[PDB]
Amino acid sequence: EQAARAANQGALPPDLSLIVKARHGGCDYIFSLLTGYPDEPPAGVALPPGSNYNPYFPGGSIAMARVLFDDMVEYEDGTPATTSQMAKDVTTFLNWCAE
Amino acid sequence: AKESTGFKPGSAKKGATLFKTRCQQCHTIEEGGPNKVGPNLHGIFGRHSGQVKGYSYTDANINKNVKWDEDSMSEYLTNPKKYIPGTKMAFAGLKKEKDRNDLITYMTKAAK
Amino acid sequence: SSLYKTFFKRNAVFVGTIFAGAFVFQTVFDTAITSWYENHNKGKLWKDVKARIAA
Amino acid sequence: VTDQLEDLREHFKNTEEGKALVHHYEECAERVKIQQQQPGYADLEHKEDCVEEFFHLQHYLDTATAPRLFDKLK
Amino acid sequence: MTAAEHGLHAPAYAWSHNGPFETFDHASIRRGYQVYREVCAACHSLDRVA
Ligand code: HEM
Ligand code: HEM
Numbered sequence: 465e466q467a468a469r470a471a472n473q474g475a476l477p478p479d480l481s482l483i484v485k486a487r488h489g490g491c492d493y494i495f496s497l498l499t500g501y502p503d504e505p506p507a508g509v510a511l512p513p514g515s516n517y518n519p520y521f522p523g524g525s526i527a528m529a530r531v532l533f534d535d536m537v538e539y540e541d542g543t544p545a546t547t548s549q550m551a552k553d554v555t556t557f558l559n560w561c562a563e
Numbered sequence: 564a565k566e567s568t569g570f571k572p573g574s575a576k577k578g579a580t581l582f583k584t585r586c587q588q589c590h591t592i593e594e595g596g597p598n599k600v601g602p603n604l605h606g607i608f609g610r611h612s613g614q615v616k617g618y619s620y621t622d623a624n625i626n627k628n629v630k631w632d633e634d635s636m637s638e639y640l641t642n643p644k645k646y647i648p649g650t651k652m653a654f655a656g657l658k659k660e661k662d663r664n665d666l667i668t669y670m671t672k673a674a675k
Numbered sequence: 676s677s678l679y680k681t682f683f684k685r686n687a688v689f690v691g692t693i694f695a696g697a698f699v700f701q702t703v704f705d706t707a708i709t710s711w712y713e714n715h716n717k718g719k720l721w722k723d724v725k726a727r728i729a730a
Numbered sequence: 731v732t733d734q735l736e737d738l739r740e741h742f743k744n745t746e747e748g749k750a751l752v753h754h755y756e757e758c759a760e761r762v763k764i765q766q767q768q769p770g771y772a773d774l775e776h777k778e779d780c781v782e783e784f785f786h787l788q789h790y791l792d793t794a795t796a797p798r799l800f801d802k803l804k
Numbered sequence: 805m806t807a808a809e810h811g812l813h814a815p816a817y818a819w820s821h822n823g824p825f826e827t828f829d830h831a832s833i834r835r836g837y838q839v840y841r842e843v844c845a846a847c848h849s850l851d852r853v854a
C-alpha cells in the first residue's frame with residue numbers, strides 16, 4: 465500500500481476485480497467516470513492541488529486524472545481505439561472480472 | 564537517437580494544454596518547481612537521464628544515459644517502456660506523430 | 676383425451692415412468708436451451724470470436 | 731475516426747434545449763467570474779459555483795447520448 | 805445532499821449484456837484486457853483474477 469500511495473500522491477488506486485459490483489451504477493458508472501472528465505471544473509469550484517474534476521464522482525474531486533485518449537492503443541482486430549470505445553471495452557472486461 | 568525519428572516544430576499552445584492534460588499530474592516543468600510522482604522537467608533538454616536532484620529514479624532510467632534532445636524525447640514519449648524497459652513512468656504514450664511534436668515544442672520553451 | 680388413454684389408460688403415471696421421464700427430459704431440455712441460448716448470442720460467444728481471430 | 735461520444739455531445743449541445751442549457755451555465759460562469767475579480771472574495775465562505783447549471787446541461791446531454799452511443803461502437 | 809456531493813447520475817447505456825438472455829460480448833472482453841494491460845495495470849491491480 466505504501467509504494468502505491470507514493471506513486472499516486474497519497475491516493476490508493478483500488479483493486480478492480482470487483483469494481484463493477486462495488487459501486488452503485490455498475491458499468492454505467494465506470495463508463496461515465498472514464499469518459500466524463502471535462503477540460504476544466506465548473507465555474508466557482510476550487511480544486512485541491514493534485515485533484516481532478518469529474519461530475520460522476522461523489523464530491524467532484526477525484527485523485528485519478530483522465531487516462532483515456534483517442535488512439536493511445538492499437539486494437540489487434542483493427543477496431544478504432546477511441547476513448548469511449550476503450551471505455552466501453554474495459555468496463556465490459558471489468559464486468560467479466562467481477563462476474 | 565536519429566535514423567528512426569522525425570521531430571519537427573509545431574504548436575506551443577496545442578502542446579501547452581497537451582502537457583497540462585497528459586503530463587502535469589506527475590510533473591512540474593517550471594524553474595523552481597518541486598518533484599512529485601515524477602521529477603521536475605525544467606532544463607531537462609540539457610542534462611542526461613535520471614539527474615534531477617532529490618528524486619528517487621529507477622535504475623533503468625539512470626542506466627539509460629541519454630542526452631535529452633527533441634528526437635530522443637519524441638521516441639521516448641511514443642512508448643516509454645519500450646525505450647526504457649523498467650521505467651516506473653505510468654504512461655502508454657503519445658502515439659500520434661504531430662501530438663508529440665506539438666508537446667515537445669512547448670516543452671523546449673518552458674524547459675529553458 | 677384419447678392421446679392420454681392410449682399410453683396410460685385411466686391410470687395415473689407410475690413413479691418409475693415419472694423418474695424415467697425426468698431423465699429423458701433433463702438431457703433433451705438442456706440441449707434445447709443451450710442451443711437456443713447460444714444462437715440468440717451468435718457473434719458474442721468466445722467460440723464465435725475464436726473463428727474470427729485467425730491472424 | 732473521432733470520438734463517438736464527444737461527437738454526440740457536440741450535436742446535442744446544438745439543439746434548442748442544448749443551446750439554452752449552455753447559455754444558463756454561461757450566464758452563471760460570467761456572474762461567478764465577476765465575483766472573483768471583486769476585492770474581498772477570498773473571505774465570504776458563501777461563494778457561488780455553477781455545478782447545478784453544469785449538471786442540468788450534462789443531464790440533458792446524457793439523456794440524449796446514452797441510448798445512441800453504443801450503436802456507434804463495436 | 806447537494807448535487808456535487810451526490811455526484812452526477814450515470815445514464816443507461818445499451819450494454820449488449822443487459823437483458824435476461826444476453827451473454828457478454830467476448831470480443832469486447834478480449835479488447836478490454838488490452839486496455840487494462842496497456843493503460844490501467846500500471847496503477848491498478850486485478851488480484852482475484854487468475
Ligand atoms: C507526455 C507527458 C509526459 C512527459 C513529457 C514526461 C516526461 C518525462 C521524462 C523526460 C522523464 C525522464 C526524466 C529524467 O530523465 O530525469 C520522465 C520520468 C518520469 N515520469 Fe514522466 N512524462 C509525462 C507524463 C507522465 C505521467 C502521466 C506520469 C505520472 C503517472 C509520469 C511519471 C513519471 C515518473 C514516475 C518518472 C520517473 C521515471 C523513472 O524513474 O523510471 N510521467 N517523464
Ligand atoms: C483505463 C485504465 C483505468 C481504469 C479502468 C481505472 C478505473 C478506476 C476506477 C473505477 C476507480 C474507482 C473510483 C471510485 O472510487 O469510484 C479508479 C480510481 C483511481 N485510479 Fe484509476 N483507472 C485506470 C487507470 C489509472 C491510472 C493509469 C492510474 C495511476 C496513475 C490510476 C489511478 C487511480 C487513483 C489514484 C484512483 C483513486 C481515486 C480516488 O479515490 O480519488 N488509474 N480508477
Ligand SMILES: OC[C@H]1O[C@@](CO)(O[C@H]2O[C@H](CO)[C@@H](O)[C@H](O)[C@H]2O)[C@@H](O)[C@@H]1O
Nearest residue numbers: 504505513514515516517529583584588
Ligand atoms: O492531475 C491533473 C492536474 O491538472 C490540474 C492543472 O491545474 O487541473 C486541471 O487539469 C486537469 C487535467 O486536465 C483537470 O482534470 C482538472 O479538472 C483541471 O482543473 C491540477 O489541478 C490537477 O492535479
